[PDB]
Structures are given as structure tokens and as C-alpha cells.
Design an enzyme around this catalytic site. Structure first.
Site, PDB file in Angstrom:
ATOM      1  N   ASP A 195       0.741  -1.106  -0.279  1.00 10.81           N
ATOM      2  CA  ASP A 195       0.262   0.241  -0.018  1.00 10.81           C
ATOM      3  C   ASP A 195       0.635   1.123  -0.207  1.00 10.81           C
ATOM      4  O   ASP A 195       0.902   1.940   0.883  1.00 10.81           O
ATOM      5  CB  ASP A 195      -1.062   0.033   1.081  1.00 10.81           C
ATOM      6  CG  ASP A 195      -2.076   0.957   1.326  1.00 10.81           C
ATOM      7  OD1 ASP A 195      -2.236   2.017   0.279  1.00 10.81           O
ATOM      8  OD2 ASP A 195      -2.387   0.578   1.924  1.00 10.81           O
ATOM      9  N   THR A 196       1.347   1.769  -1.340  1.00  9.46           N
ATOM     10  CA  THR A 196       1.937   2.866  -1.366  1.00  9.46           C
ATOM     11  C   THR A 196       1.113   4.473  -0.318  1.00  9.46           C
ATOM     12  O   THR A 196       2.002   5.370  -0.282  1.00  9.46           O
ATOM     13  CB  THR A 196       1.603   3.307  -2.812  1.00  9.46           C
ATOM     14  OG1 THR A 196       1.007   4.038  -3.574  1.00  9.46           O
ATOM     15  CG2 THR A 196       2.887   2.578  -3.699  1.00  9.46           C
ATOM     16  N   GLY A 197      -0.463   4.136  -0.013  1.00  4.45           N
ATOM     17  CA  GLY A 197      -1.430   5.407   0.535  1.00  4.45           C
ATOM     18  C   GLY A 197      -0.759   5.057   2.092  1.00  4.45           C
ATOM     19  O   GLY A 197      -1.291   6.109   2.459  1.00  4.45           O
TER      20      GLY A 197
HETATM   21  C1  LIG Z   1      -6.783   8.626   4.152  1.00  7.40           C
HETATM   22  C2  LIG Z   1      -5.071   8.034   3.796  1.00  7.40           C
HETATM   23  C3  LIG Z   1      -4.685   9.171   5.624  1.00  7.40           C
HETATM   24  C4  LIG Z   1      -4.049   9.066   3.159  1.00  7.40           C
HETATM   25  C5  LIG Z   1      -5.043   6.621   4.682  1.00  7.40           C
HETATM   26  C6  LIG Z   1      -3.196   6.379   5.728  1.00  7.40           C
HETATM   27  C7  LIG Z   1      -3.462   5.574   6.252  1.00  7.40           C
HETATM   28  C8  LIG Z   1      -1.639   5.501   6.898  1.00  7.40           C
HETATM   29  C9  LIG Z   1      -1.592   5.078   7.839  1.00  7.40           C
HETATM   30  F1  LIG Z   1      -0.144   5.323   8.622  1.00  7.40           F
HETATM   31  C10 LIG Z   1      -2.061   3.673   7.791  1.00  7.40           C
HETATM   32  C11 LIG Z   1      -2.505   4.100   7.148  1.00  7.40           C
HETATM   33  C12 LIG Z   1      -3.364   4.318   6.455  1.00  7.40           C
HETATM   34  S1  LIG Z   1      -5.045   3.786   5.303  1.00  7.40           S
HETATM   35  O1  LIG Z   1      -4.300   2.246   5.592  1.00  7.40           O
HETATM   36  O2  LIG Z   1      -6.133   4.625   6.219  1.00  7.40           O
HETATM   37  N1  LIG Z   1      -4.814   4.180   3.962  1.00  7.40           N
HETATM   38  C13 LIG Z   1      -4.129   3.516   3.111  1.00  7.40           C
HETATM   39  C14 LIG Z   1      -5.597   3.147   1.903  1.00  7.40           C
HETATM   40  O3  LIG Z   1      -4.513   2.392   0.894  1.00  7.40           O
HETATM   41  C15 LIG Z   1      -6.580   2.320   2.683  1.00  7.40           C
HETATM   42  C16 LIG Z   1      -5.958   0.343   2.938  1.00  7.40           C
HETATM   43  C17 LIG Z   1      -7.327   0.323   3.104  1.00  7.40           C
HETATM   44  C18 LIG Z   1      -7.647  -0.240   4.705  1.00  7.40           C
HETATM   45  C19 LIG Z   1      -8.783  -0.805   5.074  1.00  7.40           C
HETATM   46  C20 LIG Z   1      -9.837  -1.494   3.864  1.00  7.40           C
HETATM   47  C21 LIG Z   1      -9.254  -1.951   2.651  1.00  7.40           C
HETATM   48  C22 LIG Z   1      -8.175  -0.368   2.239  1.00  7.40           C
HETATM   49  N2  LIG Z   1      -7.449   2.187   1.284  1.00  7.40           N
HETATM   50  C23 LIG Z   1      -8.520   3.135   1.198  1.00  7.40           C
HETATM   51  O4  LIG Z   1      -9.158   3.176   2.249  1.00  7.40           O
HETATM   52  O5  LIG Z   1      -9.383   2.570   0.256  1.00  7.40           O
HETATM   53  C24 LIG Z   1     -10.889   3.581   0.158  1.00  7.40           C
HETATM   54  C25 LIG Z   1      -9.753   4.211  -0.136  1.00  7.40           C
HETATM   55  C26 LIG Z   1     -10.762   4.674  -2.164  1.00  7.40           C
HETATM   56  O6  LIG Z   1     -11.036   2.928  -2.273  1.00  7.40           O
HETATM   57  C27 LIG Z   1     -10.823   2.727  -1.524  1.00  7.40           C
HETATM   58  C28 LIG Z   1      -5.691   5.639   3.790  1.00  7.40           C
END
Ligand SMILES: CC(C)(C)[C@@H]1Cc2cc(F)ccc2S(=O)(=O)N(C[C@@H](O)[C@H](Cc2ccccc2)NC(=O)O[C@H]2CCOC2)C1
Ligand SMILES: [Cl-]
Ligand SMILES: [Cl-]
Ligand SMILES: [Cl-]
Lengths: 99, 99
Positions: free
Chosen positions: B25-27
Site C-alpha cells: 500500500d503506497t498510500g
Molecule cells: C487516507 C489516508 C490518510 C491517505 C490513509 C493513510 C494511512 C496511513 C497509515 F499510516 C496507516 C494506514 C492508512 S489507511 O490504511 O487508512 N490508508 C491506506 C489506503 O490505501 C487504504 C487501505 C485499506 C484500509 C482498509 C481497508 C482496505 C484498504 N485504502 C482505502 O482507504 O481504500 C479506500 C479509499 C478509496 O478506495 C477505497 C489511507
């Protein structure tokens, strides 16, 4: 380009004639942008993230330039903390992960 | 390897002697794994994303094998819906985005 991951992979996008900053996010299935006006009709969509789900507006066939590469596809608009370019558009610009 | 983004970039990881499936996960700035036991001291942390925040346990200096590549760093443990390999460990395996 080749983008390393020592810093967030933030790029400039152009949507609706406006420049915005967005995150290239391989962990996001979909592209989600902060509140803005887009043309046409929208459909409802629920998207799930780290802390649960958010309601977003789904706009289809939207023209968006990502780091100078043109894409046309689905853009979700809602209360996201950051503009996210997800896999639906990363595939259109030919993005891959490499190691 | 070169990983395309037509599907979620899921890989097998080994952490704390267990095999798990995780998303490259690059995001994600940080690596977050579903509830499990890890050795050593931890401190609490809140991480935010789509849907708000979750409380996690922060373990430092944890070894993870990702696609056969060994990496060491901070691992967060908590109620994440998916195991996430974030930038802190993607950099260690030499992962880049290319288009
Ligand atoms: C927003 C921010 C601040 C950049 C978040 C950055 C972040 C930073 C961290 F240090 C730890 C966790 C996370 S995070 O994990 O919160 N996340 C990563 C993101 O790729 C997420 C992964 C993921 C989490 C749960 C279930 C499935 C996938 N995908 C997402 O929200 O997809 C959604 C978004 C659109 O497509 C579906 C977004
Ligand atoms: Cl699309
Ligand atoms: Cl780290
Ligand atoms: Cl490097």
C-alpha cells in the site's frame, strides 16, 4: 517516472480545470477526491477504509490528468482526508509496483 | 517482480512466525496488521484514514519477510480490516511506482 516511497507519493492532478495534489495509492481500489463540483449525475457508493465507511458520490467518465497522463473514469467525491488516486485510474496511466 | 494493479496487490508476508496475506500500500505511511501477538514493548497510537481513526499498538524493530525480502521496522497492530504493508517497509524492499 519512477517514484520511490521515502516520502508520500504525491502528484499534481488536473480535474475540472483545477490543479490539486493527490496520493498515488495502490491500497485504494477507487479514486476519492475531496468535495468539489463535477458535471452530470451521481450514484451512491459506500467505501470502507481503516476507520470504517464513508458515503461518497460516484461520478462516471470524468476526465482527469494525473502527473500529465490523461485518464477518463470513475471519480468518487466525499469526506476523504486526502485526494486519493486508486487502482481504477492507476491502471489507466500504466502504473505498476516494482521491486 | 513487476506487479500490475488490475487486482489488489496482495502478497504473502511472514511476521512473528505466522504467514499472512497483506496489501502493498503506497498510500499508507505505516504498516498495520490485524490482531496478533508480537514480542517486546509497545506504545499506543491512533492512525487515521477513510472512516476516521483506530487505536493500535506500536511495536518497533519487528522483522517481516515480504515476497522473500527481509525488512525491519515499526509494525502497528490493531483492528484493521486488511493487513497493510506501508511505505516504512516498502522502501526497505526497494519498492517503487513506475509509469
Ligand atoms: C487516507 C489516508 C490518510 C491517505 C490513509 C493513510 C494511512 C496511513 C497509515 F499510516 C496507516 C494506514 C492508512 S489507511 O490504511 O487508512 N490508508 C491506506 C489506503 O490505501 C487504504 C487501505 C485499506 C484500509 C482498509 C481497508 C482496505 C484498504 N485504502 C482505502 O482507504 O481504500 C479506500 C479509499 C478509496 O478506495 C477505497 C489511507
Ligand atoms: Cl474507472
Ligand atoms: Cl519504521
Ligand atoms: Cl531507494
Amino acid at each position: 517516472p519512477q517514484i520511490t516511497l521515502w516520502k508520500r507519493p504525491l502528484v499534481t492532478i488536473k480535474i475540472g480545470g483545477q490543479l490539486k495534489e493527490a496520493l498515488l495509492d495502490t491500497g485504494a481500489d477507487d479514486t476519492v477526491i475531496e468535495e468539489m463540483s463535477l458535471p452530470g449525475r451521481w450514484k451512491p457508493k459506500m467505501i470502507g477504509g481503516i476507520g470504517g465507511f464513508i458515503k461518497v458520490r460516484q461520478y462516471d467518465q470524468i476526465i482527469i490528468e494525473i502527473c500529465g497522463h490523461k485518464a477518463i473514469g470513475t471519480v468518487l467525491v466525499g469526506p476523504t482526508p486526502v485526494n486519493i488516486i486508486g487502482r481504477n485510474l492507476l491502471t489507466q496511466i500504466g502504473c505498476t509496483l516494482n521491486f
